[PDB]
Design a protein around this ligand. Structure first.
Ligand code: 4QA
Length: 369
């Protein structure tokens, strides 16, 4: 294919995120950068930290321009503080261009960097609406599209580690079957609408507004499938019932306890498949994505294979994280305001699937206002 040099440009450690090499400044300083479709800032470690193997040294970059404004980005699990500036940026195993982009030089952080993750910064691929300090700080992808002829689309194949980030197009070697698209509801996070949920083909039977309360997003930076409290409770009750051939402690379903099996004896067949139906591109038409227990039971790094249940509770809406994305080739078609899913080219009884079309009425009522 024409995008062959972008294939296998991602690396990662299981549950620690997927990262791409990015070259900043002059002379070049290459760093490993987390690919994050759930945020909109490009930021790099720019001072020593015990979890960083390398960091950005602004004084060595002749093309660095200080914006003379600080920036702070806070989350429930971690945060960072830094200084704004601009510098030349290229992605050596990405598009053949160099752009001048905003870059936040992280000088201090709290529980942000991960010990042994091998990444030193973050590439926020979402929209300006959620950029810090505000929506006037142009995100990296926006700069790329404004400054070059690279088409306004990227696609991710996260292999549950390595993967591919294809910038400016779609690589047909990365998927099988058809690509099915769901609208991007609003350009802030990559917001989508979930219209039905099934556990082993059995409808969870919740009002669909609950699945998207207060939003549903596609986020390569989040490990789990995160569900709103009411949905999480019903989903666990159904998964437990479907996996009744084996009993697990209550804490396992809450991610407080792990369960380990003798190497290669994991009874995948006892756990159910989970299907999320997404709003399609035509009136009353939907499609579904189906994930296996190999996606939602995450290995924790012996003669025993330990797993963590990777479906968890959220109070800020549904988050379709790496648990969801790992089964699929995901196209972030910004130009057409849509997200595409297809079966990823990366057991003997079941496979992840993308199927359609289905008829689903009143899907417009599923969204939060
Ligand atoms: C691979 C993950 C586990 O590790 C990291 C580490 C850093 C950044 C990210 C990307 N990324 C950063 C933001 C994220 C998810 C993961 C988050 N997103 C929510 C924002 C509001 C809407 C709903 C989604 N809430 C958190 O506390 N996060 C977090 C999670 C872990 C650490 C952290 F500091 C923040 C991920």
């Amino acid at each position: 294919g024409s995008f062959v040099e972008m294939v296998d440009n991602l690396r990662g450690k299981s549950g620690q995120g997927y990262y791409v090499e990015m070259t900043v400044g002059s002379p070049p300083q290459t760093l490993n950068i987390l690919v994050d479709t759930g945020s909109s800032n490009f930021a790099v470690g720019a001072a020593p930290h015990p979890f960083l193997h390398r960091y950005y040294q602004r004084q060595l970059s002749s093309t660095y321009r200080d914006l003379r404004k600080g920036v702070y980005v806070p989350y429930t699990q971690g945060a960072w503080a830094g200084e704004l500036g601009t510098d030349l940026v290229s992605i050596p195993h990405g598009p053949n261009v160099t752009v001048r982009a905003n870059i936040a030089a992280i000088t201090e952080s709290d529980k942000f960097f991960i010990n042994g993750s091998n990444w030193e910064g973050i590439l926020g691929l979402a929209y300006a609406e959620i950029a810090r300090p505000d929506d006037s700080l142009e995100p990296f992808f926006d700069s790329l599209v404004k400054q070059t002829h690279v088409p306004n689309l990227f696609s991710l194949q996260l292999c549950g580690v390595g993967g591919s980030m294809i910038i400016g197009g779609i690589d047909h070697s990365l998927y099988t079957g058809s690509l099915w698209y769901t609208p991007i509801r609003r350009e802030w996070y990559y917001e989508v609408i979930i219209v039905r949920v099934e556990i082993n083909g059995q409808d969870l039977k919740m009002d669909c507004k609950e699945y998207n309360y207060d939003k549903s997003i596609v986020d390569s930076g989040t490990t789990n499938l995160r569900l709103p409290k009411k949905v999480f409770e019903a989903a666990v009750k159904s998964i437990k019932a479907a996996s009744s051939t084996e009993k697990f402690p209550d804490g396992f379903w809450l991610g407080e306890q792990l369960v380990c099996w003798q190497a290669g004896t994991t009874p995948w067949n006892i756990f159910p498949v989970i299907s999320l139906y997404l709003m399609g591109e035509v009136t009353n038409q939907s499609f579904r994505i189906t994930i296996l227990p190999q996606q939602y039971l995450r290995p924790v790094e012996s003669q025993d294979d330990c797993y963590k249940f990777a479906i968890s509770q959220s109070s800020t809406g549904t988050v379709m994280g790496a648990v969801i994305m790992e089964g699929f080739y995901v196209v972030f078609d910004r130009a057409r305001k849509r997200i595409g899913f297809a079966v990823s080219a990366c057991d003997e009884f079941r496979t992840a699937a993308v199927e359609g079309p289905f008829v689903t009425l009143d899907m417009e009522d599923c969204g939060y206002n």
